Design an enzyme around this catalytic site. Structure first.
Site, PDB file in Angstrom:
ATOM      1  N   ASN A  70      81.687   1.014  80.153  1.00  0.00           N
ATOM      2  CA  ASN A  70      80.714   1.265  79.094  1.00  0.00           C
ATOM      3  C   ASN A  70      80.659   0.050  78.175  1.00  0.00           C
ATOM      4  O   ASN A  70      81.667  -0.309  77.549  1.00  0.00           O
ATOM      5  CB  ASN A  70      81.074   2.529  78.307  1.00  0.00           C
ATOM      6  CG  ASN A  70      80.218   2.711  77.067  1.00  0.00           C
ATOM      7  OD1 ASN A  70      79.129   3.291  77.125  1.00  0.00           O
ATOM      8  ND2 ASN A  70      80.706   2.206  75.931  1.00  0.00           N
ATOM      9  N   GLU A  71      79.486  -0.578  78.097  1.00  0.00           N
ATOM     10  CA  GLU A  71      79.252  -1.743  77.234  1.00  0.00           C
ATOM     11  C   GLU A  71      80.325  -2.815  77.418  1.00  0.00           C
ATOM     12  O   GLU A  71      80.916  -3.306  76.452  1.00  0.00           O
ATOM     13  CB  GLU A  71      79.169  -1.322  75.769  1.00  0.00           C
ATOM     14  CG  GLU A  71      78.140  -0.268  75.498  1.00  0.00           C
ATOM     15  CD  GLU A  71      77.972  -0.038  74.012  1.00  0.00           C
ATOM     16  OE1 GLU A  71      78.908  -0.388  73.250  1.00  0.00           O
ATOM     17  OE2 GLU A  71      76.903   0.482  73.600  1.00  0.00           O
ATOM     18  N   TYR A  99      70.417   0.634  64.507  1.00  0.00           N
ATOM     19  CA  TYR A  99      71.088  -0.669  64.394  1.00  0.00           C
ATOM     20  C   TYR A  99      70.072  -1.803  64.391  1.00  0.00           C
ATOM     21  O   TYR A  99      70.141  -2.721  65.204  1.00  0.00           O
ATOM     22  CB  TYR A  99      72.086  -0.862  65.535  1.00  0.00           C
ATOM     23  CG  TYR A  99      73.360  -0.067  65.441  1.00  0.00           C
ATOM     24  CD1 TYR A  99      74.108  -0.054  64.280  1.00  0.00           C
ATOM     25  CD2 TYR A  99      73.812   0.669  66.523  1.00  0.00           C
ATOM     26  CE1 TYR A  99      75.265   0.668  64.191  1.00  0.00           C
ATOM     27  CE2 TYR A  99      74.962   1.406  66.447  1.00  0.00           C
ATOM     28  CZ  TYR A  99      75.692   1.396  65.279  1.00  0.00           C
ATOM     29  OH  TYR A  99      76.857   2.123  65.200  1.00  0.00           O
ATOM     30  N   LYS A 159      77.253  10.730  63.950  1.00  0.00           N
ATOM     31  CA  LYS A 159      76.009  10.901  64.682  1.00  0.00           C
ATOM     32  C   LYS A 159      75.923  12.236  65.432  1.00  0.00           C
ATOM     33  O   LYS A 159      75.107  12.343  66.354  1.00  0.00           O
ATOM     34  CB  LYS A 159      75.823   9.756  65.676  1.00  0.00           C
ATOM     35  CG  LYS A 159      76.006   8.397  65.088  1.00  0.00           C
ATOM     36  CD  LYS A 159      75.239   7.360  65.892  1.00  0.00           C
ATOM     37  CE  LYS A 159      75.287   6.007  65.222  1.00  0.00           C
ATOM     38  NZ  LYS A 159      76.720   5.578  65.067  1.00  0.00           N
ATOM     39  N   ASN A 181      72.354   2.152  76.574  1.00  0.00           N
ATOM     40  CA  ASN A 181      72.733   2.637  75.243  1.00  0.00           C
ATOM     41  C   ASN A 181      71.792   2.018  74.226  1.00  0.00           C
ATOM     42  O   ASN A 181      71.934   0.844  73.887  1.00  0.00           O
ATOM     43  CB  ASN A 181      74.170   2.262  74.891  1.00  0.00           C
ATOM     44  CG  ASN A 181      75.176   2.948  75.756  1.00  0.00           C
ATOM     45  OD1 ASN A 181      74.848   3.888  76.476  1.00  0.00           O
ATOM     46  ND2 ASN A 181      76.413   2.502  75.684  1.00  0.00           N
ATOM     47  N   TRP A 236      74.009  10.833  71.820  1.00  0.00           N
ATOM     48  CA  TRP A 236      75.282  10.381  71.264  1.00  0.00           C
ATOM     49  C   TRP A 236      75.335  10.796  69.801  1.00  0.00           C
ATOM     50  O   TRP A 236      74.558  10.288  68.994  1.00  0.00           O
ATOM     51  CB  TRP A 236      75.432   8.867  71.397  1.00  0.00           C
ATOM     52  CG  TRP A 236      76.798   8.447  71.057  1.00  0.00           C
ATOM     53  CD1 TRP A 236      77.240   7.985  69.855  1.00  0.00           C
ATOM     54  CD2 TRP A 236      77.944   8.514  71.909  1.00  0.00           C
ATOM     55  NE1 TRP A 236      78.591   7.737  69.909  1.00  0.00           N
ATOM     56  CE2 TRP A 236      79.049   8.060  71.160  1.00  0.00           C
ATOM     57  CE3 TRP A 236      78.142   8.915  73.234  1.00  0.00           C
ATOM     58  CZ2 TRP A 236      80.331   7.987  71.693  1.00  0.00           C
ATOM     59  CZ3 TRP A 236      79.402   8.830  73.764  1.00  0.00           C
ATOM     60  CH2 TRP A 236      80.488   8.372  72.996  1.00  0.00           C
TER      61      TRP A 236
END
Ligand SMILES: N[C@H]1[C@H](O)[C@H](O)[C@@H](O)[C@H](O)[C@H]1C(=O)O
Ligand SMILES: N[C@H]1[C@H](O)[C@H](O)[C@@H](O)[C@H](O)[C@H]1C(=O)O
Ligand SMILES: [Ca+2]
Ligand SMILES: [Ca+2]
Ligand SMILES: [K+]
Ligand SMILES: [K+]
Lengths: 837, 837
Positions: free
Chosen positions: A394-395, A468, A562, A462, A542
């Protein structure tokens, strides 16, 4: 016969290293009494620097005499991040990984006429075990079930990567027929050979028998035997979906061939479904198009960490299911069997992954532990029909791109990264050819350019446009770009969300004010895009919960806010937006004000104060009442409707109704309203506590004091407000206050604050925090100096609250506070006025 | 002139002893950054042994140049339990007593060229300071405001027992006229003689000037000048009541005789009222019969302790005032000035006392410190017209009579006790002749037989018939016998209350099940007896809030749970019982189910589950709906009505309406309902978590998992339930569980537990706590042994939770669990059943 029971009880615990703690005769009476599941990291809910390190667990094993000739398997379902098991002082085994189970045959080390001592040394400081980086707390301790299984000397393998030893699949699945495949291992720990019969009993969803397989087998003393029995094709089979979770039970029985004595038994479920992903038409389940309606879920709950009992996992699942979700990204680590049991039985498609996040470091032994966790996850959760995809990264470029800038620096890290990535893709498809692989990328095209996006079967984006940075419309623009450039990569939006804080509300919501309303705005734009775009197979929101992330500051420090429900699993109002859109079977009518129960507003004279009340609903038309008075009907669009409601009375009862499929549907609740006067005189001052969130457009309601601080307003003749300055904002944590968000916004370069007010004595509270890491200023009120030279950062330092109260005698018709800069700028974070005399 | 501001900000704190912690050149950089108000004792919300000892506070004081010629007065509004104050390393002064202010002229110790160090040593261990015993936590630290006041060299005395130095009272009050006496002191801190003008300005409630009094005074150097000035009689004075809090502002001003420049100014309120207590006819206010509708209020809030900001005191008052109270017993200590301000201005009669509780010890200086604390309370609060009585002792024989049963042991202790009471009574009458004296007794006639009840003007009885023993009707019986035997002693019921726990509900409420329903039964009985008995002046309900008492176990350890509101000041349902009885001016219609939002019950077939829904209201008749379906109109008696409500659906909407003063009044809310089948089969087992609160008639809903555990029921053919045994109950705290009340009740000497369930694979969980401080026993399920020799107290100790899960294969049509004793008795505190396969 097989006996499985827990040993979660009667433990002793000691945080920290301790020499001799494994010994049978060690004195532990001064240790803390605990009961599993347990974690030593509740501190992570207040401290950013939570204790990462060693902790010791001790429990006596006094064996039942009926187990004297059985094999004794010990199972730890998870311990973060690693554990070493001692029986009577003897090292028995070790496990690396915080989210997968481990099991050990502990028969040789046990006695049957003396007490035995179980001692577990657990460590969550180790940097060679995933995750080493990521947006969540690395909780330490034994926080899942611990089992003892006693079995007869011939049994199924229970020491294969902590799994059940059996593996069921379906090589072919069609409407007309499907094929079953039941595989596993049998182990014989007797000193002599043995002749056995193996039986596979297969039952329809309705409980009746469909088929029995029998095969005789022989094993010599100490051998393990691998079987693999196909089954007669099932005709017109009952297919599984989240909505129709038809399950076939498979009971696998092992008996002595002569005496037909039962030895061991193990039940599992199976289901028949097929699926594919299409870069152009999305996901297909059993041949039909199927929009994946997903949420991600972290496994912790404030203040107990991940030490949840199994009814809490099931409670979590009921909430996600009653919301209408059909898909779950089990992230970033594999979760409790209690949860996966519910996705099979009650019905939810599943994505499960291991926590390799942010950056592949050059840590010796990291890659190898990663591959073992991938095999462990897959073998332990192999028999769950709900799971259709495994993931492992993930990322993986996020911190790598932040920490390395030159192409020279990137070179070795991208190579390490691409290496571990292809390696795990191969380990995955070697452990399981029936499921899809997946990876999740942060919002960067470099996952394309570096090659990482050709590796897995499908890709997860994502995406946080409109949170952001960016625009809310950048989300669908980013996805349309990816689809024209990479039309064969099928996409899931594997993450999207916006923080919210129940204490904050705005009539003009913006990103990073953390108001209930901005998160709603963000999700109300994202969800139709997900539902109405064909090349989006689905989204996983998320996150389902607010969850522990000790490193975060922002409005709720230590918490990632969140969620669609709070940390205690009370739902936010926006939960019912999802429900309105996703549950068509029942009526959904929810007044979206459970998050806004304590309202205030500035009142002109005696006129009502207008504030919005929002409704989430799947009905097409809804009518809202306040204290019996109708505010008209309104047509819903996007499952929502807002009324401008006139508040006046202080405990108003709100009531909503509308027709659904011929039945009347109703909802209501009471809330609290406090009018604040725009024009102060001696009457409306009695009992008034006028409090302003200076520099912000949000109402802030303390959850400690229940006081509401009004949005800032400029000074106007007859009224009150600020003079000059600009709005300033921080996301760093503020020391010495429960009311963080109130101090994180300020009016910078402020010139004054004025209250038109009658003569008298007044209490003035000034709230300061220096967020600009130097400011020094004087303060005068009606021409008298109340501070010669106030420098918040010299008195208290940066990001630290100062609350100063003054008693002030007003002999004028106004209260005029002026700021006199001498270094840096003048700023003010909050102000509160009361009339005393 | 006069400047008053806080220095609550920018402090450093160190818990424990420290040498040289007062020196200016000390290094306190590694201490804790804190903002007053502060307590070091948040541990008391979890730990019974909360830390009692020493703590150090340090602050830099940097003085304004404009204060160079002024006197600086330092005022600590509270530090528990004692403080020693240091300026630049020099001992300035000390104060003994945790609930009264202290003040010091710190001018001689300060410099204006270099910064100053304020250090405070605080200690909450001293046994010579009251309280040494009592049912609340003795929090340490500086938990009220700290002030700097700079005044010119001639100023009102600010160092008289921490008070304002002025004393205003009304020696005669009638409807026709009242007198007014304005007294105080002026201090000349200059080395030169001074000639001054003293002005009193008296304002009507409406703000207009009524009278100006002026006197010239002359003070030698260093002199303290006592003035006593009589105003003109006030004609037809506006009388003060809680319902009409008319205040007259007295403004007192000091001017330089020649230059007429203003030096100092102090504002106070007075009011005109007279009161009387009669043994036959109760309380009279301003000549009129008046029932005291009171509550008591502790000053802490979980988890911040007494460290409340002043808007939290005001929040607490508003809730108390909205309930209809007209009387507050401020106990067991004097409290924040912010609270007394609301009593005067928004309207509430007040009793205030100091905390001399349980036993007069044999400790030197204890008597002296009690006397000093009484003078401090009266002088600091002398000018609050809401205060009508002072007290100083609460249940002063309670621990005396537990500890000593022989006349020789009792004789000295009784002499010490009567001596101190008689000492404090004359100190009280010296300090203030304008107010009544009071003493609170526990439920024993020994206060009459010792002569304690002959000392004060009025007596209070703390009465708990129907809680700590006896029947509810023993309440009015105890009172009737007191009145006939001591008819001249006027009586307040100064404490009465019953514990409750939002998690516990019972259809058959009984004392010490801690159900919400039993507290309602108890208060529904006590309140009308208070309203209707003429010789009861009134009552003060114990307590307004759930409050910190570290030594308490019971259902919510560390908390005394007799509140009308929870610790976080969310009201209980029964708060609205008081509101309906006590507010006639507004309509009150409250569905009494905010305490019971997560319901469950045993369902026969698909028939609806019936459960009581109570309503609190001052309407004469209410109509309850459930999901639009009406359930009839009921006539209210004692401000309440109960409906028998049929629950079927999961999210029912309850709606109530009636008429009040011509207008329609409504209320409504959603709750959750979970039906649990009486007869188990294949269909209803999917998704079922059958959990039972064994050995209790209470539903227990965990506030951690949200799961409701059903009241126990005996086994019946085709259903499920217990076999054998009696109920047992412990109040001791249960280690290792968040769900204490579940483990505090059990079925003792149980014989089995049985479920008539289909064949399959079941998960059984058994819950154990040995509460009888030895039991060992075996367990079998359908004849399969699952525990050969389980001893909870030998594996875990007494009063500690065990949660054991077993997996069992059921080949029968019932699940039969049998207990087989060995030593002690068999027991079970909980059982939970799920179907796996
Ligand atoms: N960066 C986002 C994604 C990540 O996978 C997740 O771990 C974070 O919590 C999330 C966020 O910051 O909201
Ligand atoms: N005993 C009762 C009276 C006391 O004065 C008070 O302090 C207690 O807390 C209270 C009680 O036991 O609930
Ligand atoms: Ca589990
Ligand atoms: Ca205060
Ligand atoms: K602000
Ligand atoms: K129980």
């Amino acid at each position: 016969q097989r006996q499985t029971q827990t040993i979660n009880d009667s433990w002793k615990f000691l945080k920290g290293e301790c020499t001799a703690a494994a010994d049978s005769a060690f004195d532990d009476s001064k240790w803390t009494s605990i009961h599993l599941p347990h974690t030593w990291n509740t501190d992570a809910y207040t401290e950013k620097d939570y204790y990462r390190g060693t902790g010791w667990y001790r429990r006596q094993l006094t064996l039942p005499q009926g187990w004297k000739e059985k094999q004794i398997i010990l199972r730890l379902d998870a311990a973060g991040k690693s554990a070493t098991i001692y029986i009577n002082g003897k090292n028995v085994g070790e496990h690396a990984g915080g989210y997968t189970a481990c099991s050990f045959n502990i028969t040789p080390f046990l006695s049957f006429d003396t007490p035995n001592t179980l001692a577990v040394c657990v460590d969550n400081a180790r940097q060679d075990i995933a995750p080493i980086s990521g947006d969540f707390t690395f909780f330490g301790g034994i926080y899942r079930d611990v089992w003892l299984t006693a079995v007869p000397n011939q049994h199924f393998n229970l020491t294969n990567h902590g799994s059940d030893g059996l593996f069921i699949s379906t090589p072919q699945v069609s409407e007309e027929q499907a094929t079953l495949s039941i595989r596993g291992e049998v182990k014989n720990d007797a000193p002599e050979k043995a002749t056995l019969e193996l039986t596979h009993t297969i039952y329809r969803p309705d409980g009746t028998l469909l088929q029995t397989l029998k095969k005789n087998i022989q094993l010599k003393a100490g051998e393990t035997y691998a079987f693999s029995n196909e089954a007669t094709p099932v005709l017109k089979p009952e297919l599984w979906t989240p909505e129709t979770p038809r399950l076939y039970r498979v009971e696998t029985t092992l008996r002595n061939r002569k005496t037909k004595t039962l030895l061991d038994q193990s039940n599992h479920y199976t289901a028949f479904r097929w699926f594919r992903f299409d870069g152009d038409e999305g996901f297909f389940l059993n041949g039909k198009p199927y929009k994946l309606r997903g949420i991600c879920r972290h496994q912790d709950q404030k203040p107990i960490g991940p030490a949840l009992t199994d009814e809490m996992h099931r409670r979590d699942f009921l909430l996600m299911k009653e919301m209408g979700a059909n898909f779950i990204r089990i992230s970033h680590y594999p979760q409790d069997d209690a949860l996966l049991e519910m996705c099979d039985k009650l019905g939810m498609l599943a994505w499960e992954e291991i926590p390799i996040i942010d950056i592949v470091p050059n840590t010796p032994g990291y890659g190898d532990n990663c591959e073992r966790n991938l095999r462990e996850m897959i073998r332990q959760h192999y028999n769950h029909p709900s799971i259709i995809t495994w993931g492992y990264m993930n990322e993986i470029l996020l911190v790598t791109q932040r920490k390395y800038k030159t192409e020279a620096e990137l070179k070795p890290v991208l190579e390490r990264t691409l290496a571990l990535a292809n390696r795990l893709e191969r380990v995955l498809k070697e452990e399981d050819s029936t499921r899809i692989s997946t990876m999740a990328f942060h919002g960067s095209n470099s996952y394309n350019e570096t090659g990482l996006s050709k590796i897995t079967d499908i890709v997860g984006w994502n995406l946080y446009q409109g949170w952001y940075g960016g625009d809310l419309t950048g989300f669908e623009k980013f996805l349309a770009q990816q689809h024209q450039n990479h039309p064969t990569h099928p996409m899931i939006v594997s993450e999207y969300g916006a923080g919210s804080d129940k204490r904050l509300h705005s009539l003009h919501p913006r990103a990073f004010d953390f108001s209930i309303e901005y998160q709603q705005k963000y999700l109300e734009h994202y969800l139709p895009v997900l539902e109405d775009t064909p090349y989006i197979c689905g989204g996983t929101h998320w996150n389902f919960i607010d969850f522990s992330s000790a490193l975060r500051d922002e409005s709720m420090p230590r918490i990632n806010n969140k969620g669609l429900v709070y940390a205690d699993r009370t739902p936010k109002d926006v939960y019912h937006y999802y429900q309105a859109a996703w549950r068509k079977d029942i009526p959904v009518l929810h007044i979206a004000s459970r998050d806004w129960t304590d309202r205030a507003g500035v009142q002109q004279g005696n006129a009502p104060v207008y504030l919005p009340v929002k409704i989430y609903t799947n009905l097409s038309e809804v009518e809202l009442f306040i204290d019996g008075i109708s505010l008209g009907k309104q047509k819903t669009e996007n499952y929502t409707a807002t009324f401008e409601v006139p508040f006046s009375n202080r405990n108003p009862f709100l009531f909503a109704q509308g027709n659904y499929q011929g039945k009347t549907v109703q909802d209501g609740l009471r809330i609290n309203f406090t009018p604040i006067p725009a024009c102060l005189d001696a009457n409306n001052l009695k009992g008034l506590e006028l409090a302003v969130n200076v520099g912000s457009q949000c109402f802030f309601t303390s959850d400690e004091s229940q006081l509401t601080w009004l949005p800032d307003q400029p000074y106007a003749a007859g009224s009150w407000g600020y003079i000059g300055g600009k709005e300033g904002t921080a996301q760093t944590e503020i020391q010495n206050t429960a009311d963080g968000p109130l101090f994180q916004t300020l009016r910078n370069e402020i010139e004054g604050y004025r209250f038109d007010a009658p003569q008298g004595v007044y209490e003035i509270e000034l709230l300061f925090t220096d967020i600009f890491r130097e400011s020094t200023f004087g303060i005068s009120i009606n021409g008298e100096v109340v501070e010669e030279s106030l420098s918040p950062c010299k008195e208290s330092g940066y990001f630290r609250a100062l609350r100063k109260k003054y008693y002030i005698t007003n002999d004028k018709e106004y209260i005029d506070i002026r700021f006199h800069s001498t270094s840096g700028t003048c700023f003010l974070n909050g102000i509160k006025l009361r009339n005393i005399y």
